[PDB]
Structures are given as C-alpha cells and as structure tokens.
Amino acid sequence: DSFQVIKNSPLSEWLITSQVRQNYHQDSEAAINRQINLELYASYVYLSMSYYFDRDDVALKNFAKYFLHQSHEEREHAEKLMKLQNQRGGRIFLQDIQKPDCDDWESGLNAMECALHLEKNVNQSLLELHKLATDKNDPHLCDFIETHYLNEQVKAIKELGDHVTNLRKMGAPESGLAEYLFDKHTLG
Amino acid sequence: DSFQVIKNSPLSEWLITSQVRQNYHQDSEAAINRQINLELYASYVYLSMSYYFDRDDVALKNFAKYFLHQSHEEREHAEKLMKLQNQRGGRIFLQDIQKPDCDDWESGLNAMECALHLEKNVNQSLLELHKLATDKNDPHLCDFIETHYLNEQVKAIKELGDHVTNLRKMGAPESGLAEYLFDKHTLG
Amino acid sequence: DSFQVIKNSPLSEWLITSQVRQNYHQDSEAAINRQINLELYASYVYLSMSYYFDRDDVALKNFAKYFLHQSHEEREHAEKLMKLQNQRGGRIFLQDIQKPDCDDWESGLNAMECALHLEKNVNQSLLELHKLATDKNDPHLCDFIETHYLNEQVKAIKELGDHVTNLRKMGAPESGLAEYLFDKHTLG
Amino acid sequence: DSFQVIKNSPLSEWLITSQVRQNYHQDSEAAINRQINLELYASYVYLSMSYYFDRDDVALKNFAKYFLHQSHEEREHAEKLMKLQNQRGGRIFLQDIQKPDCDDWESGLNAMECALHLEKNVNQSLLELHKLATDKNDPHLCDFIETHYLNEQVKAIKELGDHVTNLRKMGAPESGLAEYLFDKHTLG
Amino acid sequence: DSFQVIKNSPLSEWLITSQVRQNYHQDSEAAINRQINLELYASYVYLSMSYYFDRDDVALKNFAKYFLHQSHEEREHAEKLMKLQNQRGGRIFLQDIQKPDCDDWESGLNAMECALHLEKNVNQSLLELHKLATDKNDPHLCDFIETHYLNEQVKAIKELGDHVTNLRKMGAPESGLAEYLFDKHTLG
Amino acid sequence: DSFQVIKNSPLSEWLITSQVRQNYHQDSEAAINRQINLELYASYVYLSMSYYFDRDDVALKNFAKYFLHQSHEEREHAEKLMKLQNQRGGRIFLQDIQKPDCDDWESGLNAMECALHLEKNVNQSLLELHKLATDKNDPHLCDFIETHYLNEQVKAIKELGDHVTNLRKMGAPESGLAEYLFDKHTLG
C-alpha cells in the first residue's frame, strides 16, 4: 500500500526562529507535515471512486455523490492542519501526492469495504500522533487532536460498517436489484 | 431502415433571388430540407412508442409520458430548422412522412434499445451536415449546428445508455417486477 | 385532392381478444384509424401555411401565428382519438402522412379560402363516422363524437366565413393596405 | 461609396512588446483598427438619417426615433471592439470619420433601402475578418466574432427586408397615407 | 490644432423657404452647423483618452470611466444643437470628423491638462457665437445659449482646475503612488 | 519546470467498446487525460502560494484569500474535464501529482509574476489541444474547448498583467507600504 510507505517514512525527510514559537518540538512539526500529505492522499482516492461510479456501464448516481462529499471533507481536514502549523510557528513542507492503488472498484460493496479499510488506517495514524504529543508534554496539540479528529473517525467507521452489513444481507454483489434499491432508499 | 433510405437520397430531389441571401450555397439549402424531413420522422416514431405503452395489457404510465415528451422535443427541433431556412433566404420543400418500421415494441428494454439506435443515427446525420458546412466556408451555419445540436445529442445518448444498463442489471425483460420498480423509481 | 383519396379507402386496409372489449365492432375500429390519419394530414397542411407567411417577401406575422395555433390544435385532436382507441380495446394501425397539395398560397385571402374548404371536408367525414356509429348501436361512441367534435367544427367554420367576408369587403387581394390592416386589427 | 474606399485600404496604413500579448498577429491588429473606423462611419450615417426625418416638411416622429436608436447601437459596437483591442495587447490607431454620401433621403422607403444596403456591406466586411482569423489559427478571435456579430447582422437584415416589403405593398412612395399609417402601426 | 482649423473656416462652407422660419439669419444657421462639428470632435477626443487608460500597462479604471462619461455628454450636446436647428427651420449640413491630435497621453496629469485646454477652447467658441447672435437681434438664440451652455462650461473648467492642482501638489507625474491614491479617493 | 515535463510526455503513457462511443479518437482520449493531470498540478501550486502568505512573518490576508479562490477554480476545471471524458465514452487514467517547484515566493510581486507565467503555459496547452481536435474532425470537442476555456484564459491573463503593472508603479518590492496599501485597496 502507498499509505504504509508514506506513513513509515522517517521524520528527517519532512523538515525544511519565529517570534511566536513556544513549547513546540521539531518532531511534532515533522509529524504534522506527514499527516498533511496523508489527508491529501485520502482526498485523491475518494475522487477516483466517485468518478468511477459515474461511468455509463455502472450508472449509480447516489454512490458517486456520496463519495464526492467524502473527498471534499478530506480536503477541508488538510487545510485545517496547515492552519495549525502556521498558528504554532512551524514551517510547511510539501511533497508529491501519490496516485491511488486501485483503478477499478468492481461494485458498490467492494468500494465500501475499501473505504472502511482506509478510514481505519487514518485512525491508527492519528492515534500514533496523539501518543507522540503526550510524550513531549504539549497539551495544546493533544486537545486539538482530541477535539477535532477522534470522535469523527469513530462515527465514520461505524457508518461504513452499517452500510457494509446492509449490502451483504440484501444479497450483493451478485444481485443488481439489491444495489439499485440500496442506492434509492439509503443513499438517496 | 426507412431512416437510411431517406438520408441517402440525392440533393437534387430536395429543391423547389432573395434580397437577403448572402454566402448561402444550394447544396446547404437542400441538405437543410432533408434534415427537416428526418426530424419529423423521429417525432412520429416517438409518438408510436408512447401510445404503445398506454395499452391495457402493458400499462406502464411513466414510460408513455417519457416518450411523449421526446416526441414534442423532436417537433420543436424541426420548427427551428424551418426558421433558419427562412432566415438565410432559402425556400422550404416538403415531402411525405414515412410510417415507423416497428409496430410492436415488446418491452421497456427493447424500446430503450431502439431509441438509442435512432439517436445515434441522428447524430451521424448531423456530423455529415457539419462537414458539408465546413467544405463551403459558411461559419454562421457551422456555429448554428455546434451551438444547438451536438451537446444535446451527446447528453441524450449518455442518458439512454444509463437507462439500458440499469434495466439489464435488474433482470429485465424476464422479470416484470424489475420493469415495474424501474417505472416507479427512475422515471416517476 | 389527397384528402378524398385517403377518405375513400376501404376499411379492410386499416386493421392490423382484449380483456376490456365490449360492444365494439371491427368496422368502427377501422374507421377510427382512418380518422386519425386524416387529423395528422390536417396538422401538416396548417404547418405548411404558417411557415409560408414567415417568408421575407410576404412578412405577415399574425397570419403565421394564427395558422401555427391551428396546427397544434389538430395534433391534439389526433392524440385524443388514439386515447379513445386504447380505451375501448382496439389496436392502432398507422400509415404514411401525405405532403400537402399546395406549395404556394399567394395571399391571405386565398389561404383563408383553402382553410374553409379543408374544415368543411373534415366536418363531412365526422358526420359519416357518426352515422356509422348509429348503425351499429354504440351509444358511447356517438356521445364521444357529439360532445368533442361537432360544435367545435361549426364554430370554426363560422369564424373562417367571417374572416373571408371581411377580407373581401376591404378590397383584397389587390390592395396590400387591406391585408396589412386586417393583420394589425383583427388577428393582432 | 466611401465605405468601399475605407474597406479596401491596405493593412500597412492601420498600425502605429506588451506583457500580455500571446498568439496575436499584426495583420489581425490592423484589421481590427479598420473595423473600428467602419463602425463609427455607420453611426454617423444613421444620425444623419434620423435628423432628416425631424424636419418640419417631413415630420415622421417614429422613423426618426428608430434611426436614432440604430445610431446608438453602432457606437456601442465600436466601443466593444476597442475594448477587445486593449484586452489582447494591441494598440489603437484612429483616423478621420467621413461624412455620409447622401444629404437628402427623399422618403421612408428610400431610407429603408439605403439602410439595408449598408447592413449587407457591414456583414460582408465581418465575413472577411472571420476568414482572416481562421487563416492565422486564432480561435479566441473567431469565437468573439461568432458570438457577438453574425446572428445580430442576420436578424437586422431580415427585419429591414420585412419593412421594405410592407412599405412597397401598401403603395409607397406615391401614397403619403401609406407612410403615415406604417409609422403608427409597425414602427410605433 | 485641428480645433483652430475647424473653427476659423468661413461661413460660406457650412450651408447646403420653410413654413416655420421667422427672424432667423443665414449666418446664424451656418454658425450652428460649425458648432455641431466642433461638439462631435470633442466627443471623439474624449473616447480616445478613455480607452488609453484601459491599456494593460497603464491600468487606471476610474480615469477611464470618468473620460467615457465626458464623451457621452459631448454627444448629447451635439444632438441638442441639431434639434434646435430643426426647430427654427434651418437645414443641417454635415462634414468629416477629424482624428484627435494626440495618440499617447503619457500620464493622468497630462491628460487632465489637455482636457482643461480643450474646454477653454470650446468656451471661447460659444462666446463668439453669443456675440454673433446679439449682432443680429435674435433673443431666442441668445437665451438658448445662456441657459444651456455657459454655466456648465464654467463649472467644468473649475472642476478640471481643481483636479490639476491636487495632482500637482501630491507629487505627480513622478510618483505613481500619487496617481494610484488619486484614482482611489477622488475619482472612485 | 515540472509543467514542461508533464506536457511533453507521449500519448501512449495516458491510456488504460462502449455502447455510447461515436467519432471519438484514441489520441483525443489520451490528450484529455494529460490535461486533467495538468489542471490538478495548477490547483496544488495555488494552494502552496495561498498558505505562504498566511505565515506570521508575511501576514497579508487578502493575497492568501485571492490565491485560495484560484485553487478552488482549478479543481472545478479538472472535474469538468473528467465529466466530459465519461460523457463521450472514454476511460479515465490517473497519475501522480507533482510537488510545486518553488517553496518560498519572497513577495507579492514575485508571486503575481509566477502566476502570470503559469497561466500562459496553461493557455498554450489548450491551444495545442484545440488544433489536435481540428485535425481529427471532431466538432463537439472543439465547441467544448472554445466555449469553456479560451475567453476565461484571456481574461485571467489580462487581470494578472494589470496587477503586476500596478505593483511595479507603486514601488514594490522594496516598499512595504506599497504592498500593504495594494492589499487594502485592490484585493480587499
């Protein structure tokens, strides 16, 4: 996975005195830059899935609309992290954004399962960022993470699990009637 | 097909100095008259399909309403072409309108496939009209065609393809439940 | 006249058990199909006259608008007859629509006189349909004809007669001022 | 005609590096300057006709108002061309504006015929500008011409033709009653 | 200057019995025609300055808007003079409109100074027209001039003088900051 | 430049029968995929500039807001191209998005100049796409490009040129007062 390769890169590759800087360690600055890159990658993956469901031989409108909304949300998350980096007096360092691993998604159920996997990966990354913050005695960063990311990740994971369960019980992926009716009643 | 017979008729059979005529070749006048005839034929075919779905042993209301709307649109297209012919100083020449080739359509899926075929034929005819216009150095006619016909044809073809795909995946034409639910949720 | 040729065709050429059919004779079914063809022919003639008055060397706007409205009305009549055919359990059979006999109409007065002639022909056809219905003891069809066609035909004929009289007394067709004044004050 | 003398002047007499210039040939710049001069000439001619119909021994108010409106429109066209010249990075070069060829117009019909002639001349000039633009592979200029000038020229020519036809059929120029009544109904 | 050449041309070159003419001398008619030509020339000069300030390497929006408004006002003045010529029973005689003397204006201050010069020239011309009117005992013409032109000229000259003074005291033309801020605060 | 490397890559690296495909050549499909990649790159560059002007030792709010708006517009352009690719029956192929070449922008004037350069590069790419479309006789694609991209590029280039000119005349980049006042009055 590209996600793993990005996440396990050393901190020394994510760095380029400010009058506002106070109690802000270099390791935290590098970790914030890495997290920015991960958020942009997630946005790109969601965009790819959305326009997959727009093809003339797939044709499920509400799936595409749902995934496009997810993409816009991921981009907002990245911009918020950049704002924090500027607030505490660090410097932003950017990198290339990788193409998504999958090119064809093959059904609604398969795409939902891939999305669940991606969300759990993002959650694990945020938990490691939090433990790094507690190791350096930085309560402002800890409070920022707790108040803006953790409960949202938990709710998103629960929603995706519910969707997967309902699609499995209805008889997908063999039954196209199931995916048609799920597109109409749950996502519409 | 009657469409092919009409479209491959020579230009000399579609002709009957105006104070407004300027840079308007005889071949273009004849081709416009032929295109008028084709649009009226398409309107007649759509009317036939619409009232097929109104029979007591078929009974799908939203299919009939959809096809009636298509018929009215084709007639509007023909009237716009007649207005252009009068604007540039040519003379309108009319011919008989042929009866449609099919008398029974047998299901919603089959009618959708026939409609897709007819739309692609109309698009091919318009492309030949455009290349004729460019061969004679007539930019006004080229701009008229580009701005009023091409993107509409592309969108109509895409919509019909989506409809055919959804009807196939649900299990039509053997499953009447599929066509009932498609009539309710997509066309209703 | 094409109208006469269409109207005097035998009933055997206008035919292709329904769960709803009751007291509905085959001769009536064939006669309804023939009447549908006649209504479509009348619509086509009115369209031709309308766009004749749009030419740059004629240029009478209100004449053209009047005739276009008549064309739309004739098409509505045809669709109502098709609906009745489906209501009583018959089957619709379509034929070619003939081109109009006249290509140039030469003045407003001449077009009004041709329209009066066409309306009287349609009225005669409807009267024969009514007597056919009474010969077979079908009161529903008789009531349909009486309530939807006869008084409308009478009012249309009276209006056209009034128009012809006024155009003659003003000095048409030699006086263009007359036709100009009729276009402004009566049809505008 | 002064129009012909202006239009057939060589491009070398219509020219005087910008940070915004891109894909903009010198020949096109000169042709735009020439077209500006032509538009201003047309405005001046319309002004002359308008105040001719204001004289005490002619006295047709609505003719004068109509021609004054045409004059204002021509001036707006010229200002739009000057704006385009500044947008693409060329330089404006101005010349003298010639007096109109006619000093007395003698009737409403004669003035309408002269106006039709002038509009057809302007249309021919715009068509030559378009072919020049296509010879140099400049799509922005082509789109500008198509979207702002061609259909307007066509509609104006059609309207003037209709006016001339109606004035001829009523008995002008010998009948003053005809011109009096035309002023009140059509132009008013 | 072209203005001087136009203004010093003899009256015999500005002439081509009306039922309304009374107490209206030929010299006054010719002088009115000459004044019409001068007003149109002033309109053309203002148009040139306006589109000079629209260039991409000058870029001062409010200067351009101000000068365009002046151009429209000059054209209104000319139309009012033509109306008077028709009211008193004279005949309008038109001539060529000369191109402006300056092609590049080089700054806001220089353009303001040129405009002040032009307005004083127009005022001198109007004063000579008034003395001509008093020499022939024509009180209506005198009252027309006094009530529609003199106070407007005085106010315009005062405004332009104020603008020039403010631009000089701020440090123009060497300081671009001065012209930027004057564009924002005084003309905006 | 990364832009040049992306734009000069061969068409064979940008490709992976549809029921809707008609008159759509493989070369055009590959060129559309390449253009999508270029639009996403431009969005990323604008995002980088925007958050550069948010730093505590730069602190110009309206510059940052302006560049963020540009970034959102570029992303909308890319999504529109993806929609077209699906409409005509091709298949989307994605690639990595490159990091921007510049990491520090050093002033408002320098950033404006870099933006002007980038916009001219995008315009050149679109012109080559148009000539490719005309070489294959595809009028729908030509009309799409003309109606959605060319005039917008021209207006954007003109605006950026005006901004650069005004910043130079005020005395930037040495005068911080100039950039402060430009941030307040022009972008605010």
Side-chain angles (χ1 to χ4, degrees), chain B residues 43-149:
Chain B
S43 186
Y44 200 31
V45 169
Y46 277 130
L47 184 65
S48 172
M49 288 205 299
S50 175
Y51 274 96
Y52 167 84
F53 281 99
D54 189 55
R55 282 161 55 161
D56 71 294
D57 56 358
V58 176
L60 293 159
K61 273 186 183 329
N62 291 325
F63 274 91
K65 244 159 144 202
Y66 178 84
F67 286 126
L68 191 66
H69 180 254
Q70 300 307 314
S71 184
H72 292 334
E73 296 290 4
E74 294 298 329
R75 164 162 185 114
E76 284 176 4
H77 287 342
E79 282 178 22
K80 193 174 213 158
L81 280 170
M82 278 183 279
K83 185 176 131 169
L84 170 133
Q85 181 82 272
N86 265 339
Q87 266 174 358
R88 297 288 305 272
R91 290 297 163 249
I92 295 156
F93 179 77
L94 296 175
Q95 286 287 110
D96 285 2
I97 308 170
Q98 297 290 322
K99 75 201 288 310
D101 287 322
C102 301
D103 54 76
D104 59 331
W105 308 93
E106 307 162 314
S107 70
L109 179 61
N110 192 73
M112 283 295 179
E113 289 172 329
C114 269
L116 178 63
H117 195 240
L118 172 71
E119 286 297 317
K120 285 165 78 67
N121 281 352
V122 170
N123 195 36
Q124 181 64 236
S125 179
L126 285 160
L127 288 182
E128 280 154 18
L129 185 61
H130 181 275
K131 173 191 85 191
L132 194 151
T134 67
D135 269 282
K136 297 288 194 274
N137 309 330
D138 190 346
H140 176 259
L141 183 52
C142 230
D143 185 52
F144 177 90
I145 287 166
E146 282 170 18
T147 214
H148 290 116
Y149 288 83

Side-chain angles (χ1 to χ4, degrees), chain D residues 3-185:
Chain D
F3 196 95
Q4 291 312 310
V5 173
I6 288 167
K7 186 183 69 80
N8 287 300
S9 56
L11 292 170
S12 96
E13 324 192 12
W14 295 99
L15 293 169
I16 311 289
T17 281
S18 179
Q19 75 191 319
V20 310
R21 195 185 184 126
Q22 184 178 133
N23 199 41
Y24 193 54
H25 201 280
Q26 284 182 14
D27 292 0
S28 310
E29 178 179 5
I32 290 308
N33 279 322
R34 185 191 293 162
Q35 191 72 32
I36 282 161
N37 194 261
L38 286 166
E39 300 287 346
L40 295 171
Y41 176 76
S43 186
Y44 200 30
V45 169
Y46 277 130
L47 184 65
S48 172
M49 288 204 299
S50 175
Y51 274 96
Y52 167 84
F53 281 98
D54 189 55
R55 282 161 55 161
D56 71 294
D57 56 358
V58 176
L60 293 159
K61 273 186 183 329
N62 291 325
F63 274 91
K65 244 159 144 202
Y66 178 85
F67 286 126
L68 191 66
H69 180 254
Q70 300 307 314
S71 184
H72 292 334
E73 296 290 4
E74 294 298 329
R75 164 162 185 114
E76 284 176 4
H77 287 342
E79 281 177 22
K80 193 174 213 158
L81 280 170
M82 278 183 279
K83 185 176 131 169
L84 170 133
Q85 181 82 272
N86 265 339
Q87 266 174 357
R88 297 288 305 272
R91 289 297 163 249
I92 295 156
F93 179 77
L94 296 175
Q95 286 287 110
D96 285 2
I97 308 170
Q98 297 290 322
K99 75 201 288 310
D101 287 322
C102 301
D103 54 76
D104 59 331
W105 308 93
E106 307 162 314
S107 70
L109 178 61
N110 192 73
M112 283 295 179
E113 289 172 329
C114 269
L116 178 63
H117 195 240
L118 172 71
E119 286 297 317
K120 285 165 78 67
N121 281 352
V122 170
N123 195 36
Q124 181 64 236
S125 178
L126 285 160
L127 288 182
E128 280 154 18
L129 185 61
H130 181 275
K131 173 191 85 191
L132 194 151
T134 67
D135 269 282
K136 297 288 194 274
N137 309 330
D138 190 346
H140 176 259
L141 183 52
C142 230
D143 185 52
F144 177 90
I145 287 166
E146 282 170 18
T147 214
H148 290 116
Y149 288 83
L150 295 185
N151 193 240
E152 298 295 308
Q153 284 305 122
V154 158
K155 295 199 294 171
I157 286 162
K158 179 65 158 51
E159 187 182 49
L160 283 169
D162 288 26
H163 286 348
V164 162
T165 290
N166 274 296
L167 279 168
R168 263 177 204 149
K169 269 180 185 196
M170 274 189 284
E174 295 76 40
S175 186
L177 189 63
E179 296 201 343
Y180 177 86
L181 291 174
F182 181 79
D183 184 271
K184 308 309 261 266
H185 300 306

Side-chain angles (χ1 to χ4, degrees), chain E residues 64-116:
Chain E
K65 244 159 144 202
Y66 178 85
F67 286 126
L68 191 66
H69 180 254
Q70 300 307 314
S71 184
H72 292 334
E73 296 290 4
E74 294 298 329
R75 164 162 185 114
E76 284 176 4
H77 287 342
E79 281 178 22
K80 193 174 213 158
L81 280 170
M82 278 183 279
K83 185 176 131 169
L84 170 133
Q85 181 82 272
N86 265 339
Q87 266 174 357
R88 297 288 305 272
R91 290 297 163 249
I92 295 156
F93 179 77
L94 296 175
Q95 286 287 110
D96 285 2
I97 308 170
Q98 297 290 322
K99 75 201 288 310
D101 287 322
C102 301
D103 54 76
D104 59 331
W105 308 93
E106 307 162 314
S107 70
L109 178 61
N110 192 73
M112 283 294 179
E113 289 172 329
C114 269
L116 178 63

